[PDB]
């Protein structure tokens, strides 16, 4: 019964992903973004200038006061509010309800996004980074507990405004292609993972791969970069740009800020490498890797000139919290949060990204010795 949740996804690009849910009875409606790098579900519950609308506590005769104050604080945002608990339903999703842990947001710090056509987060990831702490049941958890849905949901992130499918409780078949490659998560708290090499244009970074996995890697939906560790970030830098060198560019363009514009169809794709990650998988000594292109990680954005030119945004960060595989990483493939069975599954998605002579792909197998060195303690 899958069907019913394919195409469940919608956003504005570099806003987020959001899906439609009701809180409260009678049903209240409002769009919450998909982040699987928190673990906290919380809506918009007063007015906002950037808010259409927010859960009314008052108006539904299901609520619950938890009497407990809550704040999270995300990499720039963060909001506070008062803990409770209420029915919930995804219309587009199973046909469930559930009683969950939310957050009624009554103040916030450059959370809410003007335009983003979201009222709230859903938290995805597990206990351990829940606030106020690990014994705030996460949404899904709850999801799982209450239900016969099993555990398990997956991503396709489709790119630009945006559109995408979660598949809650399972798989569908027809949202990609290949063969899925499975990567163990390391710890249950963010969706964590070990990369194990990095390549560029098929030359390898030639790192300690402990380098890879300082302090951390995860995959964050809710994050839109992706975003590298200090030492690993300018490597790899350094690699596209002496790839592209034939170009010239702003240095603030490398770092985020400028973006770079072309000729309306004339972007030079070809002088921007590929990035292969090759993460861990199932069997000892063998992993596969995921191979972004370069329309991945240079992003579009509206040119606030007159000029209707192609302008882009290198979406490439420098982390001081370990690698972010974001939204960017993840649009493109299908990806798989096998809870269940502690994994992560990968597979190229039928929204794949479309370049002219290359291809995003997910391949393996491949032999990678002494894997578990690559883990960061
Ligand atoms: C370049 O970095 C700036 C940046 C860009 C973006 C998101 C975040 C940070 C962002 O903060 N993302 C958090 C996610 O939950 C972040 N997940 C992480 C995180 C970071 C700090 C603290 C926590 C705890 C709450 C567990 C979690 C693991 C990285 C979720 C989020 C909160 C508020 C607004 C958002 C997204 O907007 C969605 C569209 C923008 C996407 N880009």
């Keep these: 019964s899958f069907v019913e949740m394919v195409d469940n996804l919608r956003g504005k690009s570099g806003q987020g992903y959001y899906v439609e849910m009701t809180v409260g009875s009678p049903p209240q409606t409002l769009n919450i973004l998909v982040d699987t790098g928190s673990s906290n579900f919380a809506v918009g519950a007063a007015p906002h200038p950037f808010l259409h609308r927010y859960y009314q506590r008052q108006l539904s005769s299901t609520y619950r006061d938890l009497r407990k104050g809550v704040y999270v604080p995300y990499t720039q945002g963060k909001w506070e509010g008062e803990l409770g608990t209420d029915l919930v339903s995804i219309p587009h999703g199973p046909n469930v309800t559930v009683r969950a842990n939310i957050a009624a ?49 997956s991503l396709q992130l489709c790119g630009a405004s945006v559109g995408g499918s979660m598949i809650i409780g399972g798989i569908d078949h027809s949202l990609y292609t290949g063969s899925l490659w499975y990567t163990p998560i390391r710890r249950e708290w963010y969706y964590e993972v070990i990369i194990v090499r990095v390549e560029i244009n098929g030359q390898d970074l030639k790192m300690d791969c402990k380098e890879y996995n300082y302090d951390k890697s995860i995959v964050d939906s809710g994050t839109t970069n992706l975003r590298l560790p200090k030492k690993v970030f300018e490597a790899a830098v350094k690699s596209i740009k002496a790839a592209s060198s034939t170009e010239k560019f702003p240095d603030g363009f490398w770092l985020g800020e400028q973006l770079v514009c072309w000729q309306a169809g004339t972007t030079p794709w070809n002088i921007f490498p590929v990035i292969s990650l090759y993460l861990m998988g199932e069997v000892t000594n063998q992993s596969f890797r995921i191979t972004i292109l370069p329309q991945q990680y240079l992003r579009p954005v509206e040119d606030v000139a007159t000029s209707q030119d192609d302008c882009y945004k290198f979406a490439i960060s420098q982390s001081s919290t370990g690698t972010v595989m974001g939204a960017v990483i993840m649009e493109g493939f299908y990806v798989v949060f096998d809870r269940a069975r502690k994994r992560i599954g990968f597979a190229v998605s039928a929204c794949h990204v479309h370049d002219e002579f290359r291809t995003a792909a997910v391949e393996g197998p491949f032999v990678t010795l002494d894997m578990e060195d690559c883990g960061y303690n």
């Design 105 to 153: 947001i009554t103040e916030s710090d450059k959370f809410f996004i003007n335009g983003s056509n979201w009222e709230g987060i859903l938290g995805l990831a597990y206990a351990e980074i829940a606030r106020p702490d690990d014994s705030l049941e996460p949404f899904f958890d709850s999801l799982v507990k209450q239900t016969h849905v099993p555990n398990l949901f």
